[PDB]
From a paper:
In doing so, HS augments interactions of FGF23 and FGFRP from the FGF23–FGFRP–αKlotho ternary complex with the FGFRS chain, and thus induces receptor (that is, FGFRP–FGFRS) dimerization.
The direct FGFRP–FGFRS contacts bury a modest solvent-exposed surface area (1542.6 Å2) and are preserved among the three cryo-EM structures. Akin to the FGFRP–FGFRS interface, the FGF23–FGFRS interface is also conserved among the three quaternary complexes and masks a rather modest surface exposed area (1668.6 Å2). As in the case of the L6-FGFR1cWT cell line, cotreatment with FGF23 and soluble αKlotho of L6-FGFR3cWT and L6-FGFR4WT cell lines robustly stimulated FGFR signalling as detected by phosphorylation/activation of FGFRs and downstream PLCγ1/FRS2α/ERK signal transducers.
Numbering used by the authors:
A (entry chain C): 150 to 360
B (entry chain E): 150 to 359
C (entry chain B): 25 to 203
D (entry chain A): 34 to 97, 119 to 975
Write the structure that this text describes.
Amino acid sequence: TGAPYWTRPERMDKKLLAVPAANTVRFRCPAAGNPTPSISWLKNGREFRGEHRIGGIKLRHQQWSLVMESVVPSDRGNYTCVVENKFGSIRQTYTLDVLERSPHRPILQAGLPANQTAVLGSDVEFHCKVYSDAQPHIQWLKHVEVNGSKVGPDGTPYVTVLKTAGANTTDKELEVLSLHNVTFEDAGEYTCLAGNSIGFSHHSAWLVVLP
Amino acid sequence: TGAPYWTRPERMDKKLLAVPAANTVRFRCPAAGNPTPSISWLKNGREFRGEHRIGGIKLRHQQWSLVMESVVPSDRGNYTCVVENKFGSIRQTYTLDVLERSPHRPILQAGLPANQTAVLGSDVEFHCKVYSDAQPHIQWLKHVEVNGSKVGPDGTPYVTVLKTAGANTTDKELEVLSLHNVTFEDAGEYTCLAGNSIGFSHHSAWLVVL
Amino acid sequence: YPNASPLLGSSWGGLIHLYTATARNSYHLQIHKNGHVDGAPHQTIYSALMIRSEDAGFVVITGVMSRRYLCMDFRGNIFGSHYFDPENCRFQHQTLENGYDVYHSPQYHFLVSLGRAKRAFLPGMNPPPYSQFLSRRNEIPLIHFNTPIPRQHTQSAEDDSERDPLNVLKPRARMTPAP
Amino acid sequence: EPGDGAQTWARFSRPPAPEAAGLFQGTFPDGFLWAVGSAAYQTEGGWQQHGKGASIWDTFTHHPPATGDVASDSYNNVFRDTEALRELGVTHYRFSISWARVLPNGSAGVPNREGLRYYRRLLERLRELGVQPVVTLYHWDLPQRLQDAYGGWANRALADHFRDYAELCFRHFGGQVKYWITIDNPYVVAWHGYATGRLAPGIRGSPRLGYLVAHNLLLAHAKVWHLYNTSFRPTQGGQVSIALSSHWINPRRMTDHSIKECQKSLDFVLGWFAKPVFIDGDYPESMKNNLSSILPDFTESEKKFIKGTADFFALCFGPTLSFQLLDPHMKFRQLESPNLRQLLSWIDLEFNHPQIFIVENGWFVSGTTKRDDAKYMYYLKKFIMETLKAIKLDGVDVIGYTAWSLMDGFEWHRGYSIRRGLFYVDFLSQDKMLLPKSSALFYQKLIEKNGFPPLPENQPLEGTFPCDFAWGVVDNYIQVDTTLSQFTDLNVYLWDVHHSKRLIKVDGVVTKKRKSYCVDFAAIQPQIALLQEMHVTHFRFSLDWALILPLGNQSQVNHTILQYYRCMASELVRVNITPVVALWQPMAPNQGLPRLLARQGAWENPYTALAFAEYARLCFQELGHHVKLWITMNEPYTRNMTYSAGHNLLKAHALAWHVYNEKFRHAQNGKISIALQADWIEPACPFSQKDKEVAERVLEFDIGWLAEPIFGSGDYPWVMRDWLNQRNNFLLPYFTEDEKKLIQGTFDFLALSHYTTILVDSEKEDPIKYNDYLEVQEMTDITWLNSPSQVAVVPWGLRKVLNWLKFKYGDLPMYIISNGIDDGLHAEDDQLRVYYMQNYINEALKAHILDGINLCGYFAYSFNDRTAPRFGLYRYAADQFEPKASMKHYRKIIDSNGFPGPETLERFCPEEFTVCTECSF
Ligand SMILES: O=C(O)[C@@H]1O[C@@H](O[C@@H]2[C@H](O)[C@@H](NS(=O)(=O)O)[C@@H](O[C@@H]3[C@H](O)[C@@H](OS(=O)(=O)O)[C@H](O[C@@H]4[C@H](O)[C@@H](NS(=O)(=O)O)[C@@H](O[C@H]5[C@H](O)[C@@H](OS(=O)(=O)O)[C@H](O[C@H]6[C@H](O)[C@@H](NS(=O)(=O)O)[C@@H](O[C@H]7[C@H](O)[C@@H](OS(=O)(=O)O)[C@H](O)O[C@H]7C(=O)O)O[C@@H]6COS(=O)(=O)O)O[C@H]5C(=O)O)O[C@@H]4COS(=O)(=O)O)O[C@H]3C(=O)O)O[C@@H]2COS(=O)(=O)O)[C@H](OS(=O)(=O)O)[C@@H](O)[C@H]1O[C@H]1O[C@H](COS(=O)(=O)O)[C@H](O[C@@H]2O[C@@H](C(=O)O)[C@@H](O[C@H]3O[C@H](COS(=O)(=O)O)[C@@H](O)[C@H](O)[C@H]3NS(=O)(=O)O)[C@H](O)[C@H]2OS(=O)(=O)O)[C@H](O)[C@H]1NS(=O)(=O)O
Ligand SMILES: [Cu+2]
Ligand SMILES: [Zn+2]
């Protein structure tokens, strides 16, 4: 019979294909028939070829495959291949979800935390918001002096942690450090330190309390 | 008796390939002889088997090719297509270097710029830092006071950048745009365009001038 | 003009699913109530992990339906626990040179895998299949996370001679005062 | 056609509208046939009066007691039946013409003139009345002579005899009667008469005998119908059908095999008789290929003889077949169900949209009950509502309704032990005068109204609640989590910053801890934000006795818990959310008490009251400057609690209130009172006085037990004391003069908590569910909406209980401390919450405006779904709080301050002076 049929069913199992951006994707719908059915490739159910894609796509008929080189975030959605001839038409819908992976140090907002002044008896709060995809860990450090100066034997500063990132605390309640009823002893250098697999990034601020 | 040779020697003149990152590559090394020479490859040293790369390698015995998917900057080097036959062997080389790419838009340092006030004809400085691996493609796009709405026919070209791409467009010195002696001639908001072969980072906030 | 896509960066606060593939099949990591971890072809409510970091580069993977923790054993067999096992059930995260994540135990060196060829994490030599994960944001609505639905059976007087089928007479519990 | 009803379960699989399920109204279509029926043997009696013949029901109840020689004596009391009909106000009487009385000696013989005279007297008496009669030619009373000579209905010649009898009926009453029914319920005449033997012939041969006798029944019905069609219709213009009967059935599981088994069961029970007369002329194929050698087959002439011999579709959905006489084999292990609406939809789909006519309906009552029945009334009301829904919501051509058994009588296998009558009659009397039952009055009102029209007491009211109204939410299982987020790591670290930021601990140094300012508590801000979203004005939570004072006495105060609660109050006040706290709540592993108290009776010792006084004083001196609406004891259980326990609870509440009044009122200016639970108790029969006083007794046993000492006169409710003295249960403690003076006025605002409504009736009919202690029978109406917890959504109950409280305890400011329902699903169950909250708030507004009560508060229940499961407005899924549509509708009601209608442009309250809140008293 001339009805279309899939040549390899074991090659048609990647229903949801996700890839980091700037990569290449490779769909295929290997079919056969008498005569060989034609292929219509629809982007989200709409006819598509190398017309709206920057860089162009290849639609070679010899292997029944569609390749896309240097994918971009503006390529997400369903992709339906149709093999059709005068004795039958069938379809198979893949899905593409191009991600965006940025493996760098935790980039946190500029100017936050900022220098602050407060009258004794008032309350302050410092803000730091990080932007990194590798689930960064955020803590706050206050610079203190242990015995003499605020500097160790190797030049390394002495700090005490104030609020670390536990598994039982969300990240909404860690981007703000609230000092309520600030006294004179709590006036130094407050550093928001964030770290992921790439490295550490920290921003410092100074709080001064006046009588 | 005679040494084997190639079927399509015209494609073997390109030892060097300037392939981009995050893109698969194929190495075609066809040959013919009596009997059939062995299909073997090497990587400037030990045997280049499938467990010395992230993602593996594939060997095709039909046209005698070696393919690697999603190339990585660690793949740079000098591969050797060595085809061995009982009547001698044939050597050929490939020098592969990968042009760096980046699977992200130019990472705009959030919070830059701010809403300074250019009151009484003061000066303004605006900041835009992009943490890209390569050197981005950055325009400033100070807005144009036409029709009031910055978006007209779905993205009207209000671009009036004064520092375009070039030798001065890097991640070291073009971070700051300095507008000096600013009178009441630039209100509303500005923008900040950065981009490469993937996408466009474009964000800014309100402005105050007098 | 290519209108700007939503902002990059902050997307890890909330549920994620760990997708992986080997160009033959695609699986999302999924934790079952019976302590079974396996690859679901689709996005299941049992595949909704919530990764939380403790140190800089040491994640813990919870999952919000099974309430388990992704924990490990000495031979590498992934499973789900109920109590924290910090010495064994806390994986060092890493990002490979192509945007793909890997999760290896800091002491067992065995990469978190969905396959059956777990190995040590050499410095970029070769990963086992299903070990190069990729975090995808959750798209399952939270209404389907309340899938546990109180639904018991009544089956009152199952004998075929019932004298009140619609339950009009509904007695109310009390306390009879017998001294 | 067969199979069109197989998707009826599918059509009813999806949840229905959660507002048109119980709040459904609408008059019945004009030209409706409101009817009330009766039988021949059940009601006539006179088994040998005026020389009538012997039925098969006079040789079955006479040594096959509890016979029908004189059941209702209606053979000679022809006047009172029509008098009851006229008083009922009905437009169709459905009686039966007994075969043995009109033709006693034989069909080929002289008809009995006396029986025909009685029937013509009945017809002329109910014709001048204005009631069109409906008659059934055969109501199981086959003459004994035909049972003996030809072998009963098993013979095939007997069918012809039927025609002869029918003929004379068509000759006599054809001018008057316009509806005829050839056979009544042929299933329980072919099966339970000739297969299982439970009824009059009672030979219990085999299933094969039953199938053959059903074949003969169908042939006789076809003969009679064709006689009518060919010889009598063009002169009298009437209709003839066969009174079929069926049940409803539901699958065990929602598969396809179970659904097909349900369809097979329905074909076996009803299609067995309905398909040959309505569709084609042969038995259903789901049963033909199952008992091939058991059931006989029609020839082609017979197939043409049976098809199309029924004008309307008479239906008999009552207790005679549903749940009583259906053979389990015909059920196919599925679930039986008395759902009239789904059955009507199945009939309409299956049998080509016929004129359905419910010619017998209504449940039964236990045989001992007098003219006060309420299970029957509500079952009839539910069935009539189902018929109305099938007419309106699904478009089923229902052309009438017939409540069964105008007056009591035989039950054909249940003797006189079952009452089904709309009119009560005492069989031990001799006059046997029809006394109208409660269901008779209900049917009177339903006919007069002609359906369920929109009542004036359920129309939504437009108007706004007064300013300074206390709109709030409730979460009494507050999630205390006193972990400190910040400033909790005292060690000094060394932070190398060059090749590092892997900071290293340096030993020997531990700094001091910063003062525990209460911003540190992490589990406080999310709750305050969630409350801030819904725009509430009064959050209500409950303190934990077992945590503040774990030991029981004041020697082990846990100051951290008190600090947490003080922060919760301070944060609530800081964001303009005035908090309301409850000192004690009975929802805990041990009565909400410390283990030491809980291991000593926990409410019997007066030391428990003294300890509660000390604990209340401590909580007043700790949280008192932030919280200023105190609730002493939050909704005590008035049922699962003894009387000494209630006495000590009252004493402890008085102690706490006087501790507040004498110590912390001139310094904090708050308010404190108790919060009861006030569900409404409505009499089941709205016109009888016994259940009215029974509802009063139940109310004063539930609400007035713990409220009259506080809000009322001071002593225990007088009805309760009388009831306990009459039963000689002298277990109610007496109030000493000192305690009566102490407790008489320990309140600042009445606080109720309404959830539902329960009906009560004062008739014992099944002592299994009876409440012998209170002599109450607690029922619920089934036309009300029900949450997955089987709790009734009754809007007017709140207004009724508010009016009752104002009438009983004077005019007081009233708070609604808790009012909410629960859900089991997630898709449409929250819509039930939306509807219930909107209607309950509307009823509260009604009670405030046009009743005059001082209601100045409302507290929606279940702030979130983590503390109170299945109840919360904020659902808790995947450790994330998402609002429900109920939250948004509640906020829409709140920020608009009620239901302003079109005039939503006024405030009119600068410096509000409504004297119910914290004022100059
Ligand atoms: O066509 C063709 O060719 C092709 O075809 C195909 O392919 C294929 C196939 O498919 C495959 N298969 S599959 O399966 O995949 O599907 C393969 O195959 C074969 C065979 O067959 C097989 O066998 S069978 O039986 O099957 O049959 C085999 O295989 C498989 C595999 O493979 C193996 N391996 S290897 O290495 O060998 O490969 C194995 O495996 C296994 C293993 O193990 C692994 O894997 S691997 O791979 O890695 O190895 C895995 O594993 C794992 C597992 O999983 C685990 N497990 S668990 O559980 O854990 O999970 C483990 O295991 C384990 C176990 O399991 C355990 O146990 S239990 O029980 O527990 O389980 C224990 O523990 O143990 C363990 C162990 O270990 O033991 O682990 C593992 C891992 O391991 S490791 O080592 O890794 O560590 O997996 C496994 C499995 O099983 O699977 O085995 C397998 C089997 O399977 S089964 O199922 O059965 O089982 O073998 C093979 C061989 O051969 O070897 O391959 C093939 C190939 O082919 S050929 O022919 O080549 O030879 C495809 O398609 S389809 O549809 O069919 O599919 C494709 O590929 C195609 O194609 C392509 O190519 C071509 C050519 O190329 S070149 O380059 O050379 O050229 C073409 O193309 C393109 O294009 C074109 C065009 O365009 O046309 C051309 O061109 C031309 O033209 C043009 C034009 O122009 S224009 O202008 O127009 O445009 C021009 O331009 C130019 O110039 C020209 N040129 S030329 O020269 O050509 O002339 C071009 O060129 C080209 O280019 S490219 O570059 O692009 O290519 C086409 O098109 C293409 N296509 S695409 O699209 O793709 O591209
Ligand atoms: Cu990068
Ligand atoms: Zn009653």
